[PDB]
Design a binder for this molecule. Structure first.
Ligand code: ZN
Ligand code: ZN
Length: 425
């Protein structure tokens, strides 16, 4: 019996990787986001629209049957055992999980499940199921680090990896004759570089390494004068500390991306000023780490989990110049003239986003100093080579990359996949 790997989706685009691994009457898929084509505008996210525009692949007996999607393609086998794995919460990996057949199990590390359910609290993160409330998120089996799931004779180990989404993982996949590896997204300069290192050791000598190539997709730009050069998550927080100590009499605010829970945690740990977060961010922190931080509501109502005594009125935050570092998420027109705002991988992400310019223009008019304090979730080009060096893959498959030819395997062979391609091991 053959082990077949199929590259259904996500090729030559950063987002929407969907790979199938099949053996006998079992098959697994990972991940489950959609592709994004910024030059395309679509009126909706209906499955047919996504299919017709090639943003999701044609798949047999995987999408929720109630959607009324009819599979057409070459697939001629029925499977007794099916499962889907999710490397991490980021949109380009998770966006369509609500379209996954409820009967098919969906596996992820438990922290990813927490993150995602919070990202999707308003139902504008994930595509809604048309058969549930807009903010419904489908079931996920939250797993522990290094758990092994058996799907027929396929064995999948879910291994934690360092990425700017907390709970990020890689997959080590075994059938009786083969051992292959899917990196997910990863880096060596984050909060837990040793998890990536431990992953490489587990991945050593894998027959087929399916590896991201995000950082090599974009040529090094000319230095942004608004940007501090940051070399690690730890370095990022030291810079934030420095920025606070240089500005003892001044409103200081910041924002980050909520999936990076550990960055928020670290800021809280080291910030000379008392940190105050938006309530939903505080609640996520409490859920994931048991950390209780001061907070303000940017919405009406109450989150029951939060201690009412830790609430700071928004009105009080707006007046502060000495006591708080607080997370600003909207109403930027209320910040003080001459204040400091630290943009730490929050949206708008960068100049590829038309909102980025308008945001910076708004801040400028208010004489608010804007500081870009970014730290990539992705392995820098050097570290990508180091990861390959530590693993020594027999065959390397670049994925999640606009320049797969730049990713080299000194240790063996390389396959540059195209959409729909099957590799028979
Ligand atoms: Zn990611
Ligand atoms: Zn990604």
């Amino acid at each position: 019996a053959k082990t077949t790997v199929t590259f259904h989706s996500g090729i030559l685009t950063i987002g929407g990787t969907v790979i199938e691994v099949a053996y006998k009457d079992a098959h697994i898929f990972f991940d489950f986001g959609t592709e994004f084509r910024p030059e395309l505008d679509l009126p909706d996210d209906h499955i047919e629209t996504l299919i017709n525009n090639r943003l999701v692949p044609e798949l047999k007996d995987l999408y929720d049957p109630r959607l009324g999607y009819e599979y057409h393609g070459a697939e001629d086998k029925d499977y007794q055992h099916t499962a889907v794995f999710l490397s991490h919460a980021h949109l380009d990996h998770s966006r369509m999980i609500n379209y996954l057949d409820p009967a098919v199990p969906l596996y992820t590390l438990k922290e990813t499940k927490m993150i995602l359910n919070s990202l999707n609290r308003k139902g504008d993160f994930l595509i809604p199921s048309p058969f549930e409330e807009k903010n419904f998120t489908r079931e996920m089996i939250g797993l522990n680090k290094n758990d092994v799931i058996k799907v027929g004779e396929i064995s999948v180990e879910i291994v934690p990896v360092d990425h700017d989404a907390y709970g990020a993982s890689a997959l080590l996949i075994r059938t009786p004759d083969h051992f292959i590896t899917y990196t997910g997204d990863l880096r060596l300069h984050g909060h837990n570089r040793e998890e990536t290192l431990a992953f490489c050791e587990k991945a050593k000598h894998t027959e087929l390494l399916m590896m991201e190539g995000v950082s090599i997709s974009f040529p090094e730009r000319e230095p942004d004068p608004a940007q501090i050069a940051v070399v690690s998550e730890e370095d990022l927080v030291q810079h934030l500390v420095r920025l606070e100590l240089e500005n003892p009499n001044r409103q200081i605010t910041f924002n980050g991306y909520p999936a990076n829970v550990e960055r928020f945690a670290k800021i809280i740990e080291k910030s000379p000023r008392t940190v105050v977060l938006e309530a939903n961010m505080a609640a996520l922190l409490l859920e994931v780490f048991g950390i209780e931080v001061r907070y303000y509501y940017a919405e009406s109502g109450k989150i029951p989990e939060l201690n009412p005594a830790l609430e700071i009125p928004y009105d009080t935050l707006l007046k502060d110049k000495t006591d708080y570092l607080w997370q600003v998420v909207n109403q930027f027109d209320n910040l003080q003239e001459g204040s400091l705002y630290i943009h730490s991988d929050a949206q708008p992400l960068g100049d590829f986003d038309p909102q980025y310019r308008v945001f910076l223009d708004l801040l400028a008019k208010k004489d608010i100093t804007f500081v870009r304090l970014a730290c990539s979730g992705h392995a820098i080009p050097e570290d990508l080579d180091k990861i390959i060096a530590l693993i020594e893959p027999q065959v390397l498959v670049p994925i999640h990359t606009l320049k797969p030819e730049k990713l080299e395997n000194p240790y063996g062979e390389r396959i540059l996949p195209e959409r729909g391609e099957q590799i028979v091991l």
